Design a protein around this ligand. Structure first.
Ligand SMILES: O=C(N[C@H]1[C@H](O)[C@@H]2O[C@H]1c1ccccc12)C1CCC1
Length: 284
């Protein structure tokens, strides 16, 4: 079926939970043996969210190459994403090592450091220009260059220096700051505006390594971001945009990381975002 009318048909019939459970039943199951090794317990935030072995990002380190991160490679859309958990106190150096080694231009953050009165990720970037961060375990230096605070999101320019070679690179930090502590946003307008700002920066384009996107577990809000982006790109590429099937795209993405889209409300919100986004692209 088309998307917008399939949407109204699920609303009128109140069957979002059944649609979402079907997706959960059909989703791929692949091994995640490296994630479960005892030496990696303090590298995982949640015991039930792990990268598959076949798609995990490897650190270029011979001691321990493990990080909780996955490469989502979308062949028809010609887009790739790295989805990862919010960094832990003992993985902030690994996180920036990955950004460096994978040649990423942008980092997309969809959570606040504290939500619901608890810590959802480490404070892994510097908050003042004159107070830079040094990660001694991976030999990297990170400096805040500029910060632009808007009503729904903040964009930061960061300098990452490999202290071993003295090479430097500019990284863009895109921080969506207004996702509610509970539920999903009422309108997708600010989330779409944010997606378009990431696109306009070059951070999703083929001349760079994959964008790094995270929330707390790296599957819920993070899944919504890449699902909406890929569906909109396919609608632009194809002769028949009504042939884009959001459930099929989500199942394709779940071949590369488990659990993408965590609730039926997140699934409905993803439909809403793609529907509204397709009108603004055109022509309008
Ligand atoms: O190569 C780098 N740093 C070097 C350190 O001296 C040490 O040897 C290298 C390294 C890489 C990973 C862990 C530990 C080390 C930067 C490239 C991303 C980090």
């Amino acid at each position: 079926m088309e998307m917008e009318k399939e949407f109204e048909q699920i609303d009128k019939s109140g069957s979002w939970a059944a649609i979402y459970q079907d997706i959960r039943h059909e989703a791929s199951d692949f091994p995640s043996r490296v994630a479960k090794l005892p030496k990696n317990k303090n590298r995982n935030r949640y015991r039930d969210v792990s990268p598959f072995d076949h798609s995990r990002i490897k650190l270029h380190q011979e001691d321990n190459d493990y990080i909780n991160a996955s490469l989502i490679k979308m062949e028809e859309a010609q887009r790739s994403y790295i989805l990862t958990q919010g960094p832990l106190p003992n993985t902030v150096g690994h996180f920036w090592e990955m950004v460096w080694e994978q040649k990423s231009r942008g980092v997309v953050m969809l959570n606040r450091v504290m939500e619901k009165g608890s810590l959802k990720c480490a404070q892994y970037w510097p908050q003042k220009e004159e107070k830079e961060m040094i990660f001694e375990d991976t030999n990297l230096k990170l400096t805040l260059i500029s910060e632009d605070i808007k009503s729904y999101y903040t964009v930061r320019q960061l300098e990452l220096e490999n202290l071993t070679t003295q090479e430097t690179r500019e990284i863009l930090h895109f921080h969506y700051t207004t996702w509610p502590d509970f539920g999903v946003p009422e309108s997708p307008a600010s989330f779409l505006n944010f997606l378009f700002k990431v696109r306009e920066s070059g951070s999703l384009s083929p001349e760079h390594g994959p964008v790094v996107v995270h929330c707390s577990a790296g599957i819920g809000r993070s899944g919504t971001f890449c699902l909406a982006d890929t569906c909109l790109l396919l609608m632009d590429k194809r002769k028949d945009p009504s042939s884009v099937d959001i459930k099929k795209v989500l199942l394709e993405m779940r071949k590369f990381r488990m659990g993408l889209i965590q609730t039926a409300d997140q699934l409905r919100f993803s439909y809403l975002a793609v529907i509204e986004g397709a009108k603004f692209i055109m022509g309008d």
